[PDB]
C-alpha cells in the first residue's frame, strides 16, 4: 500500500533518502498488535481513530485528554491519516494531567498497570508501550521501565529535549528499553534532541503533523514526537512476524538507515528508523 502526500515523517521511515512524500507500507498495518500510549490521555472519539482507541486507566479526575499531547502521539502510532500502524489497537493511560505534568509515583504506577493489564487484552501479535515523557534521573522510574520491558512489552521512550546527554534523564537512561532521538526533514539531528551512548535509534521529531483534541490536527516538535514513530514501527513489524517485543529495538537498529544523519556527536548512534518495505 502507499499513502500519497503523507506527513514527511511517515514518508521518511519508508525511504532510504529524505525528500519523499509517499508512505509505503504493508497492508497488515499492525492489525492484531496493541499499543499503550502513556501520556495525557486520548480523545478516543476522534474520527481518525476509527473506533480503534480507548481509555483504559486514568490517575486524575477524568479520562479526557484536556491537553492534546496524548492524542497527538497516539495519532502518530495508529491514526488513519497520520499513523505508522494504521490498524493497531490503541489503549490510553492518563498519567499526566492536562497541563502535561505528573508525579514520578504516578508514572511508575502507570507502567506497572500496563504490565498487568495486557494480560486481560486480546493482542495476539504483541504489545508495545509509547512513553513520550521524561524528567531528571530517577533509579525508581528506570526500574519501572525495565520491569515493563521484562514483562513482555516493547517499551519505547523519548530521549528528552535538552540538547544534552540522555544519561541524566529518566526513563531515557534505562538501557533495557528503546531510547529514541529526534531528526528533522533534512536528516539533521533536531536541535533540541538529547544524545549519548544510551540512545538506540532516531525517528522523525521536528514539525510532526498529527491528531489534536477537539477533532482537530496540529504540528509540533520534540523527541516526544519521535517516540511514537518507533512504537508504531515496532507494532507494525511484530504483526509482520519479523521480530518480538524482547528484540524489536535491536531489530529496528539492525535494519535502520545507517549514516544518513548530520550533527550526530561522536559516540551517538547514526541510525534512522526504516521499515524496509518492498512491494
Active site residues: 39, 69, 224
Q: Which stretch binds Ca ion (CB under 5 A): 60-68, 106-114, 174-182, 210-218?
A: 174-182
Nearer to Ca ion by Cβ, of 73 and 248: the residue is 248
Q: How far apart are CA 63 and CA 6, in angstroms?
A: 30
Site for Ca ion contains 16 (CB under 5 A): yes
Q: How far apart are CA 166 and CA 117, in angstroms?
A: 29
Nearer to Ca ion by Cβ, of 19 and 175: the residue is 175
Q: Which three cell numbers stand for residue 33?
A: 498488535
Q: Which H or E run includes 223?
A: helix 223-240
Which x/- pattern, by CB under 5 A, does the window 149-168 give for Ca ion? --------------------
Q: Number of helices (H) and strands (E), helices first, in the chain?
A: 6, 15
Stretch 199-228 residues interacting with Ca ion (CB under 5 A): 200
126 phi-psi bin (left φ>0, alpha ψ -120 to 50, beta other): left
Site for Ca ion contains 260 (CB under 5 A): yes
DSSP string of 7-74, one letter each residue: -HHHHHHT-SSSS---EE--TTTTTTEEEEEEES---TT-GGGTT-EEEEEESSS-SS-SSSHHHHHH
Q: Which three cell numbers stand for residue 31?
A: 492489525
Stretch 175-194 residues interacting with Ca ion (CB under 5 A): 175
Q: Could you tell me the smallest distance in angstroms from the CB atom of residue 249 to Ca ion?
A: 6
Nearer to Ca ion by Cβ, of 180 and 225: the residue is 180
- CA distances to 181, 204, 212 from 87, in Å: 25, 21, 19
Site for Ca ion contains 263 (CB under 5 A): no
Nearer to Ca ion by Cβ, of 48 and 260: the residue is 260
177 annotated to bind ligand: yes
Q: Could you tell me the smallest distance in angstroms from the CB atom of residue 4 to Ca ion?
A: 21
The SS3 of residue 111 is helix
Q: Which stretch binds Ca ion (CB under 5 A): 48-56, 107-115, 171-179, 267-275?
A: 171-179
Q: Which stretch binds Ca ion (CB under 5 A): 16-24, 38-46, 153-161, 213-221?
A: 16-24
Please enumerate, by residue number, every residue annotated as part of a binding site.
16, 175, 177, 200, 260
> Which residues make up the interface to Ca ion (CB under 5 A)?
16, 175, 200, 257, 260
Please enumerate, by residue number, every residue annotated as part of a binding site for Ca(2+).
16, 175, 177, 200, 260
Amino acid at each position: 500500500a502507499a499513502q500519497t502526500n503523507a506527513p514527511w515523517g511517515l514518508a521518511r521511515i519508508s525511504s532510504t533518502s529524505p525528500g519523499t512524500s509517499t508512505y509505503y507500507y504493508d497492508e497488515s498495518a499492525g492489525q492484531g498488535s496493541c499499543v499503550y500510549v502513556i501520556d495525557t490521555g486520548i480523545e478516543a472519539s476522534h474520527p481518525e481513530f476509527e473506533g480503534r482507541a480507548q481509555m483504559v486507566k486514568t490517575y486524575y479526575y477524568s479520562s479526557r485528554d484536556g491537553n492534546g499531547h496524548g492524542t497527538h502521539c497516539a495519532g502518530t502510532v495508529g491514526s488513519r491519516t497520520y499513523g505508522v500502524a494504521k490498524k493497531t489497537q490503541l489503549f490510553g493511560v492518563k498519567v499526566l494531567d492536562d497541563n502535561g505534568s505528573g508525579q514520578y509515583s504516578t508514572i511508575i504506577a502507570g507502567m506497572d498497570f500496563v504490565a498487568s493489564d495486557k494480560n486481560n487484552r486480546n493482542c495476539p501479535k504483541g504489545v508495545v508501550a509509547s512513553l513520550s515523557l521524561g524528567g531528571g534521573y530517577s533509579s525508581s522510574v528506570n526500574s519501572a521501565a525495565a520491569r515493563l520491558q521484562s514483562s513482555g512489552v516493547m517499551v519505547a521512550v523519548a530521549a528528552g529535549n535538552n540538547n544534552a546527554d540522555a544519561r541524566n534523564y529518566s526513563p531515557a537512561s534505562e538501557p533495557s528499553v528503546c531510547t529514541v532521538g529526534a531528526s528533522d526533514r533534512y536528516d539533521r539531528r533536531s536541535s533540541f534532541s538529547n544524545y549519548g551512548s544510551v540512545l538506540d535509534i532516531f525517528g522523525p521529531g521536528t514539525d510532526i503533523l498529527s491528531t489534536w483534541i477537539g477533532g482537530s490536527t496540529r504540528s509540533i516538535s520534540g523527541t516526544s514526537m519521535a517516540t511514537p514513530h518507533v512504537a508504531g514501527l515496532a507494532a507494525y513489524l511484530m504483526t509482520l512476524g519479523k521480530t518480538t517485543a524482547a528484540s524489536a529495538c535491536r531489530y529496528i537498529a539492525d535494519t535502520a538507515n545507517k549514516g544518513d544523519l548530520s550533527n550526530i556527536p561522536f559516540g551517538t548512534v547514526n541510525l534512522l528508523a526504516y521499515n524496509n518495505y518492498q512491494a
